[PDB]
Design a protein around this ligand. Sequence first.
Ligand SMILES: Nc1nc2c(ncn2[C@@H]2O[C@H](COP(=O)(O)OP(=O)(O)O)[C@@H](O)[C@H]2O)c(=O)[nH]1
Lengths: 426, 48
Amino acid sequence: MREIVHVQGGQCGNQIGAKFWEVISDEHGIDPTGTYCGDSDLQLERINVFYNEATGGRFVPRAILMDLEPGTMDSVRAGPFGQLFRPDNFVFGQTGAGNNWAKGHYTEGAELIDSVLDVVRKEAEGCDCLQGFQITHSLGGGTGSGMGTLLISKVREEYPDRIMETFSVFPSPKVSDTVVEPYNATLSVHQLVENADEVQVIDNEALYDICFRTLKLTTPTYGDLNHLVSAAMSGVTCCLRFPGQLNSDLRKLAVNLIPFPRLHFFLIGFAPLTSRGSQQYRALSVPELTQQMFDAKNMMCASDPRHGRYLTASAMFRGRMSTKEVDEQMLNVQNKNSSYFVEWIPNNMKSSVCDIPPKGLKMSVTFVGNSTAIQEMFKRVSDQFTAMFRRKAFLHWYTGEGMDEMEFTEAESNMNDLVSEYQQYQ
Amino acid sequence: PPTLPFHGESAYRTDYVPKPLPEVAKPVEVKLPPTLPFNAQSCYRSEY
Ligand SMILES: Nc1nc2c(ncn2[C@@H]2O[C@H](COP(=O)(O)OP(=O)(O)O)[C@@H](O)[C@H]2O)c(=O)[nH]1
């Protein structure tokens, strides 16, 4: 009865959500030809959230593939699980957005946005009531930051009631690429503060941090760290997709995690995770998932939760478990670690229980929390932005294609006051 | 007098020959974990 429409923009966005449709497929028994194998009532009764029928029995994903190049959307199509998406929902664009935010937002992305908005209006409005939109993009390039936020602006005015959950990938600046990361990041943040209900902040360095000091991988590749993101994307909408003892919804997360509308930037994480020679050494109980869901490194953003306070927090447990432990462990972290938890909200925790655990595992859990330590991400991009800005850095591309100087100062204002608003509640 | 016959072959004429094409045939064959069979065996039949 409720549908999530996934729109993926950018090279980062298309590759992450290709893993997302791969993990949703085997959570739902979908073969990469559309056929469904394996017999279970629960794996199809709520598949309308992510798949539609095709009068051939083919379950087709709600994917609105987008990038301003015939590049990674060719590799997504040619790879495994690439025949699922409609060839119609593959809007190409041939001019190219070269890591420039104004390219996707103003001067090349404005002539293809009228087609991807037509596609998403054909595919999302043609039902009784859609639950919301799920947008996957990186705010580091030109396509995800530029075209992604342009569609975000147009969707929030056409549907100013639905939930837009955005798994944004902020530029992690300690080790990174492209020299225009602070320009593309800050020029998108001052839009995501208004017209975006939820923004889950993801940094690549934290994905390497899990891949090095939790999974003990040899060579963490882009596919492995896109798999960890798709774990969190599937885990948040678990109750929307399967029955449970304590069901939830994306609006239940929104109303229990947003004290004020501007503060909606969440730290995400997901860990019943373990190394290769330790799953047969490590147990599995609610306290053990709890202690690896607050700790330091399970966060997929490079922001230490100890360097701040939790305004509010939520926990999406999955699988067969006792309802006493899922309540008592959130109490136990609340009263033991009280410094990293605000007081003007008492009892800052939501728990919610799915009954169907993910494939292979016995129980999993995903964190989404509104920690005020997210100020150190906007500060770590602002101090790079003002460094370039004082001597008028790589800018004649941005100004030459139709941006005045006031847009950049307005970018600094709405992101400096975001840090200041997080200061008042820390 | 003889003619010193022109031995010579440019960069563009020497230093590449057609390589063999790379041998690529490997998909990601993933064995699906079977759906774990479900008894959160419900209330009516469970106690009465
Ligand atoms: N997680 C992830 N990040 C990516 C991937 N490809 C590129 N990135 C990151 O995205 C940034 C470049 O932006 P990108 O989305 O590729 O450019 P765009 O296509 O113009 O939007 C770089 O800092 C990369 O680290 C990917 O497949 N997965």
